[PDB]
Amino acid sequence: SMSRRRVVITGMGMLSPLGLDVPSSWEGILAGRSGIAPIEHMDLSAYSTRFGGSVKGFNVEEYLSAKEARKLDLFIQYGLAASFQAVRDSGLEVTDANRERIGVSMGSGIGGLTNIENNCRSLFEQGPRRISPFFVPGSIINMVSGFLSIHLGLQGPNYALTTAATTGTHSIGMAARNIAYGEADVMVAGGSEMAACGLGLGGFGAARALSTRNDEPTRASRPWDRDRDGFVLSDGSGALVLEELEHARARGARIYAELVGFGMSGDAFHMTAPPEDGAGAARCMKNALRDAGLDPRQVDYINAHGTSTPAGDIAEIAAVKSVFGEHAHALSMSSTKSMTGHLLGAAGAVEAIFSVLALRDQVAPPTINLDNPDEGCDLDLVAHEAKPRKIDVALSNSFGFGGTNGTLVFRRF
Amino acid sequence: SMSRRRVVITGMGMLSPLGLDVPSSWEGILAGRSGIAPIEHMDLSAYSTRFGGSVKGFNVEEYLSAKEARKLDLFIQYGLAASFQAVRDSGLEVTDANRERIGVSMGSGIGGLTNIENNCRSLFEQGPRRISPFFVPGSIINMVSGFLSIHLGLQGPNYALTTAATTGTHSIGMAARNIAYGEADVMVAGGSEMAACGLGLGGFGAARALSTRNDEPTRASRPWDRDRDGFVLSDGSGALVLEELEHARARGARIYAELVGFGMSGDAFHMTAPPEDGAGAARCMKNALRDAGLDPRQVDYINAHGTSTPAGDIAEIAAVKSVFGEHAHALSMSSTKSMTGHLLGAAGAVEAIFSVLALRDQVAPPTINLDNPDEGCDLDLVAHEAKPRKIDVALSNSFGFGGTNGTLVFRRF
Numbered sequence A, B: 001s002m003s004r005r006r007v008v009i010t011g012m013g014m015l016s017p018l019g020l021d022v023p024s025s026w027e028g029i030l031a032g033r034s035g036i037a038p039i040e041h042m043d044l045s046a047y048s049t050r051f052g053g054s055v056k057g058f059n060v061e062e063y064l065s066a067k068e069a070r071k072l073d074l075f076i077q078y079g080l081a082a083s084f085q086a087v088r089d090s091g092l093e094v095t096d097a098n099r100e101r102i103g104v105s106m107g108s109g110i111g112g113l114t115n116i117e118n119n120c121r122s123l124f125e126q127g128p129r130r131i132s133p134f135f136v137p138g139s140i141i142n143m144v145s146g147f148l149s150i151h152l153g154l155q156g157p158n159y160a161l162t163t164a165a166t167t168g169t170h171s172i173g174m175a176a177r178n179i180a181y182g183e184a185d186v187m188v189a190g191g192s193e194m195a196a197c198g199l200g201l202g203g204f205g206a207a208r209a210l211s212t213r214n215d216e217p218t219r220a221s222r223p224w225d226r227d228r229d230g231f232v233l234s235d236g237s238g239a240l241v242l243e244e245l246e247h248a249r250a251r252g253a254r255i256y257a258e259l260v261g262f263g264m265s266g267d268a269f270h271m272t273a274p275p276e277d278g279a280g281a282a283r284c285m286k287n288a289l290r291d292a293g294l295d296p297r298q299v300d301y302i303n304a305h306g307t308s309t310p311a312g313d314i315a316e317i318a319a320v321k322s323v324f325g326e327h328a329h330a331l332s333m334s335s336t337k338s339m340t341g342h343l344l345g346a347a348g349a350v351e352a353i354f355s356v357l358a359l360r361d362q363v364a365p366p367t368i369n370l371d372n373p374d375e376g377c378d379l380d381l382v383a384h385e386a387k388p389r390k391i392d393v394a395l396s397n398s399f400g401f402g403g404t405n406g407t408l409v410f411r412r413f
């Protein structure tokens, strides 16, 4: 704990509704662009929600051969894309000397819902003889970590989290712990999701979790706005190359930031709804700050969970107020879900990247669509437009079904 | 690493094809009873495999009210059952003083395949308005950890692994790390699975992973036997209460054993097939022994992965030979999958329990059906009948799709 190794971010990668890499996504974020649109090439006329954030124009053949790619669900494709981008971005070379010290932890919330839909259809219409032989290996959540390790020869710790909307945040935090306690020197960590099929929209629609603002998809995700009506379902991926500091310094790696804190908590409250005061979120953020050895006054920017739900958004404000007190009125906090929608198991991965870039570029991304902040939402929520400011420390929150909570703390380096 | 806290097992719980708790399962194991039978209340006439290990006579109402239980997929039901059994067995009392120091890590390989099947059927026949509102929260893998935390008021680290057949082993190992590095004082860890639906049998059947010995289901699982033809799909759950040693001693807990070692590796080889020498398994077992600070000569019993696959079984023997050398001929190694079949994400959880009970009762469980050991399978594989012997250290292996590997080391206490 006092003798643990320090962990830095040397590589990043992303597919989002705003772009096919980190630079293009971030340009969208800093412009206040929505990635949400009507979902195409899919007949959603029966569904109460017919829009979301899709990854537009993705070519898996930049990362995999066609033959390899056809084995895999889109969530795996997306996770490999972000991973390969992050590894490349890191400049790391995998050798016989280091391959056992490099692991992977790429998770998903829902996994291969699209493959399950297609295979279920084949099963019901034709029978079990039309199930793909790649159905199981190409749809299971740990096959990002698995295929990444195969393709790059990674022999270190190899696993996958699934903690709903918290997955990406946990995947990064726990990979950092791996490095900090010397179980690995490098980890590829993050997550991916592709739930914009009928089971996903249908499932989340039946749970009454989604916005139904079909007439104005770009206005649907509106965190802390009084006309919010639930979250927007989005697809994509994020990956970070985490690396022990001295390992990174020794090879002259470009270091984007230091991952100084990781906190976890459980609400122990409700399956899908938070406690109204956000007490689990508060405990989680405290754990993270204490983990980082930071005073709350050192936090400059919070990338909120901020999913555009009635209860969730207000609970998150209550938690930030509780943890930060008067300093809650000094920091900036925004929800990039206003633009990206909710990427579920990838949300914390892409939001970790946006947090790192906020530190790099000294700029708080906007919460777009925040026209009439609800009762109690009186913080600097960066309404409408990106805000240049001093950011030495950034915090990223994720909260998921089951009351599972994760916070990461990043520090300028 | 040198200053980490020690971790002991103070509670255990299980549903398996051999019983509805730990004592009844273990009685079956020590008798050499098969849990495999034709799967009933399910029309499998179109499928190439029509048998498996089902949990027979389970009453979820012993653990949950009917109202709560109807929200949840069977895999969640099974995981809560084992968890509640383990917590009860531990004698731990959850209070305002300790609830933030008690977490949960219960995983699954496949998750709520049964719920997805049912909901997919409703979606296709009727439309998205017949999807259950509980479909998403009651089918996602992290809802064991989530519901357990809600029901028992656990506010500590709350997560879920999904690493195929390795899930249960990773869930225990990583929960132990939580305690060892002081992120929690107690963890409920393990896994659960219920894949014996059509998508599971169909999926694994299309992948050519399963035995098709429909005429003699009890003979199908035959690890290291020359007539093996793939694994047997089984359902169930296992949970351990892990606890910091001084915490357990201070409350006078009954301690079953000490969890001394956890190792991970990745093969970085093939999606579904191992390297023929089992080199990943070897690295993993070495990592675990080094983690435990044990000489290979200290291992008395190995609970093998031993799934009854052509390549897998031989690769595991090669790995044990490589790691243990001449001591490979001194230990006993058995596969309890001979009796239980392959519980997928729960396999390592139930096999951790069988390893702990081997230490408690000084007895190596049998590998039943091992009539003609294949070329190279010349170890003490405990063919046919349980073998009383000295066991101070037991090792449990799990290997999963993606080449992800896990080993746990338990020591008498």
Ligand SMILES: C[C@H](CCC(=O)O)NC(=O)c1cc[nH]n1
Pocket (backbone or CB within 6 Å): A165, A271, A272, A273, A274, A275, A278, A280, A281, A307, A309, A311, A312, A313, A315, A316, A319, A399, A400, A401, A402, A403
């Ligand atoms: C239970 C919800 C999960 C959010 C999601 O599905 O992404 N949690 C919150 O909304 C929340 C707010 C503050 N703390 N938890």
Ligand SMILES: C[C@H](CCC(=O)O)NC(=O)c1cc[nH]n1
Pocket (backbone or CB within 6 Å): B165, B271, B272, B273, B274, B275, B278, B280, B281, B307, B309, B311, B312, B313, B315, B316, B319, B399, B400, B401, B402, B403
């Ligand atoms: C790739 C397989 C996974 C086994 C399973 O699906 O449960 N791995 C082995 O069989 C194996 C044997 C030795 N090392 N890995």
Ligand SMILES: [Cl-]
Pocket (backbone or CB within 6 Å): A118, A119, A122, A130, A131, A132
């Ligand atoms: Cl298909």
Ligand SMILES: [Cl-]
Pocket (backbone or CB within 6 Å): A215, A216, A217, A218, A219
């Ligand atoms: Cl619009």
Ligand SMILES: [Cl-]
Pocket (backbone or CB within 6 Å): B118, B119, B122, B130, B131, B132
């Ligand atoms: Cl239904």
Ligand SMILES: [Cl-]
Pocket (backbone or CB within 6 Å): B215, B216, B217, B218, B219
């Ligand atoms: Cl039989």
